[PDB]
Design a binder for this molecule. Structure first.
Ligand SMILES: O=c1ccn([C@@H]2O[C@H](COP(=O)(O)OP(=O)(O)OP(=O)(O)O)[C@@H](O)[C@H]2O)c(=O)[nH]1
Ligand SMILES: [Mg+2]
Ligand SMILES: [Mg+2]
Ligand SMILES: [Mg+2]
Ligand SMILES: [Zn+2]
Lengths: 1114, 221, 80, 105, 93, 43, 263
DNA sequence: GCATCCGTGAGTAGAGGAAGCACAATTTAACACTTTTGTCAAG
DNA sequence: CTTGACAAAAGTGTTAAATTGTGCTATACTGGGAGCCGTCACGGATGC
């Protein structure tokens, strides 16, 4: 099956590594392999040098270097034993006695740092997790207008999150310039005096504006000494505390000048220098030295504010949603932030220990307690909003998870308090953030995806590539630039016609600061690389995207993440060209390292002898269970003695076919209504799909149980369970565990367990019963593990962990734990959900035998019938064009690649359909068959519909219908043709994760809640359905008083009523009258706890007791 | 002493009680300053109040001191072994009278209860208490089988004589709820102790004979 | 007087229905000082207590209807 | 018997609050840390709020239904149903009066 | 649609009175074991079983059919309720 | 719903609230945004 | 204060709020008996007032009281009754109920307007007490207790049980509900037809009132128990008896989509 | 006329989720012994 | 139906050992510590 490629645009660079946002950021933070003397002041190395040295204020503790050790356990062992994949951390510290001059050095153990796997994830307590990148406002200096009063501006200084307070500079109506700090507004001159600024200094530079400088010229504080001004400022900041200079300088220096408390950031310092046109020595607002404060940023910020208000041409306001003002915090920065938090706590315990207890006899190891540091790191990797359970339904699911961008999390926005403006598609999103891939609902615009060609720079700003255009010719030089840098040029579109490298069009479509213009070739300065750089990886997998509405393209890209792997999965007939790279970068398949020869091929491992002579053996993951329950295994694709080149495929991974992404099947589709089984998105399929094992997938479930120590005695896992027949114990081995290979059904025992009965004398009726049969009560009871309703399959694995085993950390009191893995093979059934890449989805409602399906004149039946009424109002025409191209490939036996916005057009599709008709109809004529009597009838109507040309021969009119994608179709039930030609072709359809097998649930009675005594919720708990307020309104509008009362009392929490109702039904009686609900009794008691006397009365205002006299004091 | 289960104002008020005690016992003849002696009494009151009020389930003072010593030992071994110690290393360092079983039992005692109102997930509509069933009140199924058993047992007893059934009910405790001695049944009817034993045993034999002919009573067992 | 839907519902006579809507602390503190008595007139009050709502089949216009056949009706009337 | 026709809410006096309660809670103890049984004069005391299982006292002298309405002379626990533990209230006697925050803020 | 629902709605002033009459009649049939019915043997509702035709066990279905024959009397304050059940129990023990 | 005089005992208040509120909710989930829902709430 | 299945204990926030008040109340008594100065006594009394405020209404005045080692405020008595999560709106105006189920919906074009398709497996659990009585009436089981054991294991269920379930539901109706329930036609009554499979079959002409379609929608099922409840559902709530709109008086169950296109 | 304070924001489903020590008081367990209570054999 | 038995299951002091509750320590020491703005926006009621 050959592959045909469309398109004209030639890409000069390939896609970057698709997981480099995760992988490269975490390597920079750790610097694990860089020698200690060559390490740069980034990552955790920068955190060590910030907290150290620690001084008592004559003892000093200093930091020299660190190193990372080998992990204790491998990745697969951590998954099986529920461990964390980590590495020990060691620090090399020295203690110096200032009074004496004696030094001691030793290496102290600091704890464990989690390690990232090769694909870019973590193993935390045995589970795979992903750290999601966070977007937030960049630090710096910003100028925005005053919303209340026109012509006025506000200057803001923003540090890194939790690294200082915000500073506001505003010109008050009275003319006084004010500075607001921590919800408190005070005149700026008071602080501006502390920085040693006199009346002669201020008016020299800012006096060239007019009336604004007069508001900074108060003589009440101008003569005041900076020390007096310092104390006065302290009183305003925190009134009530005693004014002392020692306390005063501590507060002012620690608010704007302490590097350990205020941090502008590398990005913030870079932004401040670019805007104000200054150069900063540090990352603080002011610099304290020689016993005085010196200004660094306050003066240049004030000059910009005054000049902006005056109206100088060169000063403009800032757009806060501009992508040059928003930056990304990746996993390395997020981890390092918590590392610095926990390190500051460690230094706080060092200080309290070095001034109390054996001061003369100290060692560095005795001072350092690393418990605070380990708790900070453990908390981040377990209970952070950005640390999420990994999505691995298919290899594409995990790739998308690693490129998501979230505005939520600690230091971010909130879902409820986010407005419209922060959710919009900004013009700078072009080439950096995908405009279509986002969740619908409360998270729309707050979670997004990185563009396919984008990359995050060292300061956290997203850049996109462009090609340099000089003198009308396009060069291959590629420049990555940010949004702020991009605004200065005229950028042409990627589809601009070229004659080699020369621009051929006279009029060129271009962007200037985000808006379309028409320009001459001599005005162009840059060019787009490809149309693929505007969208994300998921959106780039949808062919004919230019013919689909964006609201339905959002559904198509999202649902590709939910497709489950199939045992006979195949690659789509029509592809875009990203299917190979997705499989390669997901690390799910196996490739050869260099040239060699295959020596051994097996279902478990492959051995390759490379041309240098060395043998490398590759084990294969087989029948592994993912986080979502889908089976992940690798199948070999080579034979013994086969020569391979570097990068050749060795074994396919899940949902791949010869190295291409394979999320479904290619089926024959007819577009027509069918007897109402297609009604409102429902789908009809053929029984022939089941016969050849299409849409068949494998799922694995895990079950667990524990044996504990109790006061009454230990629980025992055993085969000898009381009161059980041999039919129940048939599949258990001698240890009480089900044998491997057994078939289990609901109610079957998996692991047998007994527990010691609690001390309780029996009821009198039971005592007489035991006397009659002469049976002695046992001391243990059945507590074994059984299959839940609606589940089952084949037992494929057992795991047994015991106390004392190496690496096993069981909780106190737990003796052993047993785990059982059960696998089932699922075929397509009524109630299962199907979808295509253009957003068309629906559940299977009918399965028909093969002789019932519509069929071609040569006897071939179709596989799927889709309703044409779902197309017009959704405006997703891409599925129609995919069907037309799939019809040509069905007869020609070829597949196609059509890139988005540069691909297959109708004249090319119609030229392929003309070749396919010559084999679809020319074959018939050679075999000795003409035109059917039934086809002549359909042709007669077809020219009354204006579909064919009158006067042509039947063969010529059948070809006219084929070029429109339509054929004559016969009815399987009657043998007569459909009255009009029907669109028939080949389409790629996926089977989604949502199956009716996992969702059907029912309940009669079961567990109840503790306090309210109402039924529990959830299928996993065997809970009932919530009958909420709006449901109660519907029953009231119907006038169904007795039906409403049953749900309120007899079926939720009337304890006496629900017991009597059950006993009446099993006796063949009608249910009795209900009584007071229990939750009303709770409300009365809770109101009495609030010292409120609530009483129920009768017609005569006499009290009525609703507690049966159980709560009345005699 | 902050961060150990009590608020800062609670620690201050507990330390004020130690200062009051120090005034009573202070002696100025010794020429020592007040803060030298009062510091002993102020620390003692704060430390004792922590060991008595910081836990929902109170643990005695001596047992609290054992738990604190056990935590110090494991911290020292952890920084020496480069990893978390096992229970056998902890027991050996604690001293004589300690084995791995005693270490595990002490750690089990030192566990604090968890709140029923703690959320799970991001959205605040799910809490711990929504997943904990109540197992004290009988279910509707269990209440019905109790009454079905009593009704079937009453019909079987009708086949017996008047006194044979009445003696059986007294002995088994079906009337008052509590069983009565052979003598106690004897005093009710005016008969001897040994008479009850044979008549009570005879009624059982008749019940077993009918039971085998109807099989209306075996399922409840 | 004219007032909106929120103010009209919060100034209702029954404190049980007003306290289950909004502003529970303000409603309960005003009812307790006045010693208010809820007569269970509307639908929400009866739902809270699990009573038969006074609407539909639970209304007093149709609730007390009797049904009888001729055989039992002739016997009662003749013997009376 | 009688049907509920009205519900009334009012303030509760100190004298009415003392008539509700079955005893005073004097200790902040919940349960013993070893036997897992309620402590005397605590927040889960059986002598105040009732027995934990039906017709069974704390000491164990009585274990059956025949002594209904009786109070053990050794432990002081009424021999009754354990469901009264959902309905019986206690009280705390304050050393100084305190205001109700509903009638203040 | 229930058979004869249009005629049933025309026999009462309020649609909720029809539901009250039907529900109380069905309770009477259940309590006396269908021995107080006003239907003739050829009018009894039937259900099809693997073993043959038998009486319909649904009492609500019986009540609706009886009410269409015109042999039932309904109203308010017809007879004392205690005296109604005593006579009906005596007639149908 | 029946095209006939209303029967005594119907909760017409609940029906009125559901009749007014339903079209507003479905319109939002499917102009109602501007000068639509806000104007109704203001009235 | 309950012990969970694993041996761990769970307790409510009210216990910690009571413990704080008792501790402060007892300390004040001892301070008064020792003749403490007025500065110490005044501090204790101010702490006692604040402890009562936290028990009644935490966070109304001042900083909320939190459990040590955490920033989550403790739940007070006022929080228990108020809000969307409070006692009124969560437990008194709406509840969770017995005899209810849920599944995915598909279209049944062969149904009548008053019929629906119900899976056998769901109906066995939904009508369990009725089925237990029916099984004992025949020779399937000797008593109700033996009947319940037979249904626990799937491989022990005989073919005659499905015939008995057919006679249980003769004439009965169920309630179908789709969320959100915007008007009263979000709940309608149907006569069930037992089907093979796991999805609920829905009539084409009731989809507009439910605002339902077949791309993943799920629905709930309920069973009315008594004769009053069944009579109300078969007379007032039946789908075939509700054809016009209560809001406008125009037909609500009417031809749509492909039914219009064919005609 | 305006500054300050306070309560409100749709439904169902899922699926993960840091002191010692000495010594007095009190509780518990061990161990005998006395008394009560069934069985057995008569009779 | 009642006697004589007959060991056994249960009840009753007695006491040593775990376990728990409480007081005490004498160089001099005398006012906390974490926060830290897309601070949510709008209406109603109260007090100046
Ligand atoms: O957040 C949500 C989303 C959806 N829904 C409920 O689910 C429905 C989903 O409706 P859809 O968005 O699927 O659209 P539709 O089927 O009405 O579109 P057409 O076929 O007419 O083109 C909504 O109309 C609402 O009933 C919610 O209640 N809440
Ligand atoms: Mg979603
Ligand atoms: Mg739809
Ligand atoms: Mg839908
Ligand atoms: Zn007792």
């Amino acid at each position: 099956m050959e592959i045909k490629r469309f398109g004209r645009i030639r890409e000069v660079i390939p896609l970057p590594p698709l997981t480099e946002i995760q992988v490269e950021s975490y390597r920079r933070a750790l610097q694990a392999d860089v020698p200690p003397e060559k390490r740069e002041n980034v990552g955790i190395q920068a955190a060590f040098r910030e907290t150290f040295p620690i001084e008592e204020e004559g003892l000093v503790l200093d930091f020299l270097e660190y190193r990372l050790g080998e992990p204790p356990f491998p990745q697969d062992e951590c998954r099986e034993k529920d461990l964390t994949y980590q590495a020990p951390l060691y620090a090399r510290l020295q203690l110096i006695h200032k009074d004496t001059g004696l030094i001691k050095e030793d290496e102290v153990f600091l704890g464990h740092i989690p390690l990232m796997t090769e694909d870019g994830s973590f193993i935390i307590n045995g589970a795979d997790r992903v750290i999601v990148s966070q977007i937030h406002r960049s630090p710096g200096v910003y100028f925005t207008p005053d919303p209340a009063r026109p012509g006025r501006y506000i200057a803001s200084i923003i540090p890194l999150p939790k690294r200082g307070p915000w500073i506001d500079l505003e010109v008050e109506p009275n003319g006084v310039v004010s500075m607001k700090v921590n919800k408190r507004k005070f005149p700026l001159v008071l602080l501006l005096r502390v920085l040693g600024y006199d009346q002669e200094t201020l008016a020299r530079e800012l006096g060239a504006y007019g009336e604004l400088v007069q508001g900074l010229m108060d003589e009440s504080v101008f003569a005041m000494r900076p020390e007096e001004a310092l104390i006065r400022l302290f009183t305003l900041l925190r009134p009530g505390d005693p004014p002392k200079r020692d306390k005063a300088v501590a507060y002012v220096y620690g608010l704007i000048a302490d590097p350990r408390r205020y941090d502008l950031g590398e990005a913030g310092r870079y932004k401040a220098e670019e805007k104000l046109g200054i150069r900063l020595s540090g990352r603080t607002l002011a610099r304290f030295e020689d016993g005085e404060f010196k200004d660094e940023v306050f003066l240049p910020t004030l000059r910009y504010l005054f000049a902006l208000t005056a109206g100088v041409p060169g000063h403009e306001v800032d757009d806060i949603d501009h992508l040059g003002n928003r930056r990304i915090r990746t996993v390395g920065e997020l981890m390092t932030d918590q590392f610095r938090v926990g390190l500051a706590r460690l230094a706080r315990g060092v200080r309290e220990r070095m001034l109390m207890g054996s001061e003369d006899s100290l060692t560095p190891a005795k001072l350092v307690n690393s418990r605070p540091l380990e708790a900070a790191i453990r908390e981040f990797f377990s209970r952070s909003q950005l640390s999420q359970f990994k999505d691995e339904t298919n290899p594409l699911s995990s790739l998308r998870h690693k490129r998501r961008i979230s505005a939520l999390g600690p230091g971010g926005l909130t879902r409820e308090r986010a407005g419209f403006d922060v959710r919009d598609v900004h013009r700078t999103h072009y080439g950096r953030i995908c405009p279509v891939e986002t969740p619908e609902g409360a998270n729309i615009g707050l979670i997004t995806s990185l563009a396919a060609y984008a990359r995050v720079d060292e300061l956290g700003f997203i850049r996109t590539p462009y090609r340099r255009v000089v003198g009308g010719v396009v060069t291959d030089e590629v420049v990555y630039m940010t949004a702020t840098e991009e605004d200065r040029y005229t950028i042409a579109q990627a589809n601009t016609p070229l004659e080699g490298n020369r621009i051929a069009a006279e009029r060129v479509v271009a962007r200037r600061k985000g808006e379309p213009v028409i320009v001459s070739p001599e005005e162009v300065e840059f060019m787009d690389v490809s149309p693929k750089q505007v969208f994300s990886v998921n959106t780039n997998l949808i062919p004919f995207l230019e013919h689909d509405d964006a609201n339905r393209a959002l559904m198509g890209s999202n649902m590709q993440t939910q497709a489950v792997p199939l045992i006979r999965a195949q690659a789509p007939v029509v592809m875009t060209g990203l299917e190979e790279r997705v499989v390669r970068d997901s690390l799910a398949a196996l490739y050869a390292e260099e040239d060699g020869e295959v020596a051994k091929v097996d279902g478990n491992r492959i051995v390759v002898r490379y041309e240098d002579g060395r043998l490398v053996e590759y084990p294969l993951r087989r029948f592994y269970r993912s986080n979502q329950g889908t089976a992940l295994d690798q199948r070999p694709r080579v034979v013994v003695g086969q020569r391979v080149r570097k990068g050749d495929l060795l074994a396919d991974g899940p949902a791949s076919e010869n190295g291409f992404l394979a999320l479904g099947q290619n089926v024959l589709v007819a577009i027509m209504p069918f007897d109402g089984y297609n009604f409102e998105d429902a789908i009809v399929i053929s029984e022939e799909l089941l016969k050849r094992d299409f849409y068949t997938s494998i799922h694995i479930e895990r079950y667990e149980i524990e044996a504990r120590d109790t006061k009454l005695g230990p629980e025992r896992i055993t085969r000898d369970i009381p009161h059980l027949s041999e039919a129940a114990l048939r599949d258990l081995d001698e240890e009480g565990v089900v044998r491997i290979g057994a078939e289990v059904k609901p109610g079957d025992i998996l692991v047998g367990r007994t527990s010691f009965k609690g001390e309780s004398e029996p009821t009198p009726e039971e005592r007489l019963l035991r006397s009659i049969f002469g049976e002695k009560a046992r001391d243990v009871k059945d507590t074994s593990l059984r299959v839940p309703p609606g589940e089952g399959g084949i037992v494929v694995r057992t795991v047994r962990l015991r106390r004392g085993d190496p690496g096993v950390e069981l909780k106190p009191g737990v003796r052993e734990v047993v785990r059982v893995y059960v696998a089932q093979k699922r075929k397509l059934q009524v109630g299962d959900k199907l979808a295509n890449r253009h957003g068309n989805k629906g559940v299977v409602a009918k399965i028909l035998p093969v002789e019932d399906m519509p069929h071609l004149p040569d006897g071939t039946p179709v596989d799927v019938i889709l309703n044409p009424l779902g197309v017009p109002s959704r405006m997703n025409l891409g599925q129609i064009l995919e069907t037309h191209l799939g019809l040509a490939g069905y007869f020609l036996g070829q597949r196609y690649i059509s890139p988005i916005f540069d691909g297959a057009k109708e004249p090319e599709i119609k030229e392929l359909l003309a070749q396919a008709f010559e084999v679809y109809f020319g074959k018939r004529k050679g075999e000795g068959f003409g035109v059917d009597k039934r086809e002549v009838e359909v042709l007669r109507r077809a020219e009354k519909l204006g579909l064919v040309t009158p006067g042509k021969t039947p063969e010529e009119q059948l070809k006219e219908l084929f070029l429109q994608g339509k054929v004559v179709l016969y009815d399987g039930r009657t043998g007569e043709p459909i009255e009009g030609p029907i669109v028939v072709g080949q389409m790629f359809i996926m089977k989604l994760y949502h199956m009716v097998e996992d969702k059907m649930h029912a309940r009669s009675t079961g567990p109840y809640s503790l306090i309210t005594q109402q039924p529990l919720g959830g299928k996993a708990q065997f809970g009932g359905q919530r009958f909420g307020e709006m449901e109660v309104w519907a029953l009231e509008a119907y006038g169904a008083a007795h039906t409403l009362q049953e749900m309120l009392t007899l079926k939720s929490d009337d304890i006496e009523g629900r017991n009597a109702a059950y006993e009446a039904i099993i006796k063949g009686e009608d249910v009795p009258e209900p009584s007071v609900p229990e939750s009303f009794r709770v409300l009365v008691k809770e109101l009495q706890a609030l010292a409120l006397d609530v009483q129920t009365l009768d017609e005569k205002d006499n009290p009525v007791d609703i507690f049966e006299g159980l709560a009345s004091k005699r | 002493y902050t961060g150990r289960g009590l608020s800062f104002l609670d620690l201050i008020q507990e330390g004020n009680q130690g200062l009051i005690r120090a005034v009573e016992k202070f002696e100025y003849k010794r020429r020592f300053k007040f803060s030298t002696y009062a510091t002993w009494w102020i620390r003692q009151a704060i430390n004792r109040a922590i060991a008595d009020q910081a836990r929902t389930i109170r643990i005695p003072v001596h047992m609290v001191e054992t738990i604190n010593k056990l935590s110090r030992t494991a911290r020292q071994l952890q920084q020496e072994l480069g990893r978390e110690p096992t229970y056998e290393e902890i027991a050996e360092a604690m001293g004589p009278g300690w084995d791995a079983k005693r270490v595990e039992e002490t750690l089990k005692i030192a566990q604090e209860p968890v709140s029923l109102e703690t959320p799970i997930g991001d959205e605040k509509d799910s809490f711990y208490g929504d997943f904990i069933p109540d197992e004290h009140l009988p279910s509707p199924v269990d209440a019905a089988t109790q009454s079905l058993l009593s009704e079937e047992l009453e019909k079987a007893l009708s086949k017996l004589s008047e006194r044979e059934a009445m003696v059986l009910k007294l002995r088994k405790g079906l009337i008052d709820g509590r069983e009565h001695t052979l003598e106690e049944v004897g005093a009710f009817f005016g008969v001897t102790r040994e008479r009850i034993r044979q008549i009570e045993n005879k009624a059982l034999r008749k019940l077993k004979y009918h039971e085998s002919r109807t099989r209306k009573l075996r399922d409840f067992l | 007087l004219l007032m909106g839907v929120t103010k009209s519902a919060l100034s209702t006579k029954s404190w049980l229905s007003a306290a289950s809507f909004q502003n529970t602390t303000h409603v309960l503190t005003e009812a307790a000082i006045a010693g208010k008595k809820d007569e269970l007139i509307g639908l929400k009050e009866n739902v809270i207590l699990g009573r038969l709502i006074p609407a539909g089949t639970g209304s007093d216009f149709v609730r007390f209807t009797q049904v009888v056949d001729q055989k039992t009706l002739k016997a009662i009337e003749e013997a009376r | 018997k009688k049907e509920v026709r009205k519900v009334r809410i009012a303030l509760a006096s100190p004298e009415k609050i003392r008539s509700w309660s079955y005893g005073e809670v004097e200790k902040p103890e919940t349960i013993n840390y070893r036997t897992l049984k309620p402590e005397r004069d605590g927040l889960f005391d059986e002598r105040i709020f009732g027995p934990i299982k039906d017709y069974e006292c704390a000491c164990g002298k009585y274990k059956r239904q025949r002594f209904e309405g009786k109070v053990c002379e050794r432990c002081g626990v009424e021999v009754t149903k354990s469901i009264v533990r959902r309905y019986r209230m206690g009280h705390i006697e304050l050393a100084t009066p305190a205001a109700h925050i509903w009638f203040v803020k | 649609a229930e058979p004869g629902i249009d005629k049933l709605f025309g026999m009462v002033d309020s649609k909720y009175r029809l539901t009250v009459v039907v529900a109380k009649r069905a309770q009477q049939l259940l309590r006396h074991g269908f021995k107080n019915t006003v239907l003739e043997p050829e009018e009894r509702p039937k259900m099809q079983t693997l073993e043959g035709l038998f009486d319909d066990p649904n009492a609500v279905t019986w009540a609706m059919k009886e009410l269409l024959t015109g042999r039932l009397v309904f109203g308010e304050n017809l007879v004392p309720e205690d005296r109604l059940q005593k006579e009906m129990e005596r007639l149908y023990p | 719903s029946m095209a006939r005089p209303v029967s005594i005992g119907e909760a017409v208040g609940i029906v009125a609230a559901q009749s007014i509120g339903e079209p507003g909710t479905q319109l939002t989930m499917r102009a109602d945004i501007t000068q639509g829902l806000p104007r109704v709430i203001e009235l | 204060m309950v012990q969970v299945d694993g041996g761990r204990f769970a307790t409510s926030d009210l216990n910690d709020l009571y413990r704080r008040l008792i501790n402060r109340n007892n300390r004040l008594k001892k301070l008064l008996a020792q003749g403490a100065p007025e500065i110490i006594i005044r501090n204790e009394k101010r702490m006692l007032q604040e402890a009562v405020d936290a028990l009644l209404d935490n966070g109304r005045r001042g900083a909320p009281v939190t459990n040590p080692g955490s920033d989550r405020p403790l739940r007070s008595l006022t929080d228990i009754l108020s809000g969307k999560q409070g006692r009124f709106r969560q437990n008194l105006l709406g509840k969770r109920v017995d005899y209810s189920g849920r599944s995915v919906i598909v279209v049944g074009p062969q149904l009548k307007l008053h019929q629906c398709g119900l899976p056998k497996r769901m109906a066995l659990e939904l009508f369990k007490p009725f089925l237990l009585k029916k099984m004992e009436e025949k020779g399937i089981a000797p008593n109700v207790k033996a009947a319940r054991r037979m249904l626990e294991r799937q491989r022990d269920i005989k073919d005659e049980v499905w015939d008995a379930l057919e006679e249980v539901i003769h004439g009965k109706v169920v309630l179908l509900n789709r969320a959100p329930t915007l008007h009263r036609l979000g709940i309608q009554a149907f006569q069930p037809v037992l089907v093979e499979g796991q999805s609920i079959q829905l009539h084409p002409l009731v989809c507009e009132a439910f605002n339902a379609d077949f791309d993943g929608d799920q629905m709930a099922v309920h069973v009315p128990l008594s004769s009053f409840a069944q009579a109300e559902a078969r007379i007032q709530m039946l789908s075939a008896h509700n054809l016009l709109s209560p809001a406008s008086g125009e037909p609500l169950a009417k031809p749509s989509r492909d039914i219009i296109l064919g005609l």
